[PDB]
């Protein structure tokens, strides 16, 4: 944590990349003041942090990073006047006005369905739940809400973020942002709630596709890294979330089973057999489908997409904690990005000057080609 001073002052002076970052954040400049009126917040030593940054151009926004060196970088709204003027603002006319449409996702919030990891921890055993996120919660923005825009990153120890750029997008209140994430939002209920899905008699396509995404990945994930059902203490969990009435079936035919495999292709016999309304004669995968989603449908942090003001860690900075880069998520790879080989400061600055001094020397250039990827079909969208 000592260490990270000397690093972070080459980082900001050889390895950011100042001119893409101004590229994304100016957006064209296009709208008077968009990139002026845009608040960072910068974390120093010791925990202490300033709020309502903001810089006149890329080359004020270099000088201050390369003075300042900061250990976290957090990325505000677009606010109606200067931040760094905002005590020379009468009392309430200082407002956030825009900003992007994100999403935050840890994997601390799955702890209740994950065996190999908890708290901040992750591992390739339980990454696929990311996978599976970043694949439902993408495919509904894209596909239901018609978003062109999205740039997911890795935000450097548990998790990943999304950031909706789409210009009327970053103009959406926070009623309508809090829309969006009931629309996607399925698992609900703290630790006091034991079942955290209840699905409907008719499933509507957002859960259907959800599911069938989910399907490609619960054998291997569920069944094989995780074993959900390779013992009692495992199985009595996953029970928990079906009826009593059908426990003791079950709890003979798991015993008389040899691997999860078998004893899920159990479960759904018995459970496409369950009679839930006694007035019809109606049987279906309903408690299959409401296990799979409580052990890996997407887990929001909701309160980070719901507010027009809230800040997110930006990305390609550092996360003090690791020492890993933030770096952007390739959607095309997303089943083989390795979170363990994205590449810490340490590394990088050791790479630099290994025997110009700029990050394509190093394994930062990769990330730095999505973000620019990502850049080009913004620029394309504005013609
Ligand atoms: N006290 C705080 N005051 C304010 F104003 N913002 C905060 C605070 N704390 C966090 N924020 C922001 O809320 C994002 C998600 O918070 P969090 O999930 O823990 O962090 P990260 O996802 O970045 O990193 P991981 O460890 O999860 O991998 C972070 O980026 C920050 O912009
Ligand atoms: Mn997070
Ligand atoms: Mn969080
Ligand atoms: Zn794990």
Redesign the pocket.
Known sequence: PTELPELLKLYYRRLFPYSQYYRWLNYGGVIKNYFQHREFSFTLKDDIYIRYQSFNNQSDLEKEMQKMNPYKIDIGAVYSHRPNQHNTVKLGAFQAQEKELVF???M??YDDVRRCCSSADICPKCWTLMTMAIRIIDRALKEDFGFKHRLWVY?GRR?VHCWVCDESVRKLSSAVRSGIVEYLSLVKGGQDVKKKVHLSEKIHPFIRKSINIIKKYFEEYALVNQDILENKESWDKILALVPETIHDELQQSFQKSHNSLQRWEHLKKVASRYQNNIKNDKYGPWLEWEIMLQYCFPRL?I??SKGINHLLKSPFSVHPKTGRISVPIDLQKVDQFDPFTVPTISFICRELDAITRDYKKTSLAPYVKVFEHFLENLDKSRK
Do not use: H, Q
């Open positions: 935050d996702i840890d601390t919030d935000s998790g942090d309160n980070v």
